[PDB]
A paper describes a structure:
We investigated the response of the zinc finger DNA-binding domains of transcription factors [name] ([name]) and Wilms tumor protein 1 (WT1) to different forms of modified cytosine within their recognition sequence, 5′-GCG(T/G)GGGCG-3′. The three ZnFs of both proteins bind in the major DNA groove. The C-terminal fingers (ZnF3 of [name] and ZnF4 of WT1) interact with the 5′ triplet (GCG), the middle fingers ([name]-ZnF2 and WT1-ZnF3) interact with the central triplet (TGG), and the N-terminal fingers ([name]-ZnF1 and WT1-ZnF2) interact with the 3′ triplet (modified GCG). We kept both strands of the 5′ GCG triplet in an unmodified state and modified both strands of the 3′ GCG triplet.
[name]/[name] and WT1 showed slightly higher affinity for the fully methylated sequence by factors of ∼2.8 ([name]) and ∼1.8 (WT1). In [name], the methyl group of 5mC in the top strand makes van der Waals contact with the side chain guanidino group of R351 at position −7 of ZnF1, which forms two hydrogen bonds (H-bonds) with the 3′ Gua, forming a methyl–Arg–Gua triad. The methyl group also makes van der Waals contacts with the Cγ carbon atom of E354, perpendicular to the methyl–Arg interaction. The interactions with unmodified C can be inferred from earlier cocrystal structures of [name]/[name] (Pavletich and Pabo 1991) and from the C-terminal ZnF3 at the unmodified 5′ GCG site. E410 at position −4 of ZnF3 adopts two slightly different side chain conformations. Both appear to be in van der Waals contact with ring carbon-5 of the C, and one might also form a weak (3.2 Å) C-H…O type bond with carbon-5 or carbon-6 (Horowitz and Trievel 2012). The interaction corresponding to the methyl–Arg contact is absent, but some stacking between the C ring and the side chain of Arg at position −7 continues.
Residue numbers in the entry: 335 to 420
Write the structure that this text describes.
Amino acid sequence: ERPYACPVESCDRRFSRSDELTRHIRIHTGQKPFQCRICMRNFSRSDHLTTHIRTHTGEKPFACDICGRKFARSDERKRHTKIHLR
DNA sequence: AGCGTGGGCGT
DNA sequence: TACGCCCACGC
Ligand SMILES: [Zn+2]
Ligand SMILES: [Zn+2]
Ligand SMILES: [Zn+2]
């Protein structure tokens, strides 16, 4: 499977979904359609723009279950929680 | 630590 | 196709 192959020369990436290839090809086109209004930096992806903006606002939605420490991203919290192991 | 950013995916 | 999650890697 993975019928959607990248057609850029030296690239061998292949994908299961059409939209995956369309997203991937932005690495080659350099297209960064999503701009931060605060610092004007451009981003390849809407979801990464959203987490980037928390760097300006200080928004930290994700609290550790053990100690309550807050993080901008779920994966930051995930990396953190395991420090509480023995 | 703080966070850029691609892949896989559900919707 | 978009939107926005988790996941993972990288610095
Ligand atoms: Zn490619
Ligand atoms: Zn910004
Ligand atoms: Zn904690």
